């Protein structure tokens, strides 16, 4: 139960920094997340820890939204705000679907960070693919398909291929990066 205290302290520090910078959306979301961590301090131990991991993911998403808003592009910022809202909405206790949607949400947060880093480095094709994939994962998590498990597995595979392309671009190997981008685009487009 001591991890919850650390997570709440970090979330409140994020809220303080957001209030200092003037990001009211991130401040409101951090306050909501702190209240959610408060109201979930006691309960079943097997689920409290998973909800704390979800709260850690949400705090990282808030950090990503904050740095995206501070350092320019608002696409990543708005997508991360929506992702944090989705995480806070699903935390409210639909376990059989939340245990599956939380992995997809964390993958979406990773893809958002990928898009932000790639845009800050001029690799705008990876950033476009990452934004498209993050939109796909967000619409799948918020959607009521209930066939979402297979589509989310497909999207996570595409996200890992995109991560491979990102690492290739960071290392300087464009020949494999373009092929990985093509493969990820094919995997994502196979969802229609």
């Amino acid at each position: 139960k001591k991890e919850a205290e650390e997570v709440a302290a970090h979330v409140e520090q994020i809220a303080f920094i957001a209030k200092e910078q003037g990001n009211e959306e991130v401040a409101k979301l951090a306050k909501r997340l702190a209240e959610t961590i408060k109201r979930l301090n006691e309960g079943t131990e097997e689920e409290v820890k998973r909800l704390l991991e979800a709260a850690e993911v949400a705090a990282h998403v808030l950090q990503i939204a904050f740095i995206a808003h501070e350092q320019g592009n608002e696409e990543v910022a708005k997508l991360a705000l929506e992702l944090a809202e989705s995480i806070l909405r699903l935390i409210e206790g639909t376990e059989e679907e939340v245990k599956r949607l939380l992995e997809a949400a964390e993958v979406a947060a990773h893809v958002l960070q990928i898009a932000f880093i790639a845009h800050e480095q001029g690799n705008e094709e990876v950033a476009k693919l990452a934004l498209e994939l993050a939109e796909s994962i967000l619409r799948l998590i918020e959607g009521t398909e209930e066939e979402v498990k297979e589509l989310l597995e497909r999207a996570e595979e595409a996200a890992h291929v995109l991560q491979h392309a990102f690492i290739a671009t960071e290392q300087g190997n464009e020949e494999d990066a373009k092929e990985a981008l093509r493969k990820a685009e094919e995997i994502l487009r196979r969802n229609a």
Binding site: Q13, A18, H60, I167
Partner: peptide, 12 residues
């Protein structure tokens, strides 16, 4: 397993 994700940003 999969290649590791980029690390989370620095805590504000």
């Amino acid at each position: 397993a999969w290649p590791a994700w980029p690390a989370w940003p620095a805590w504000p």
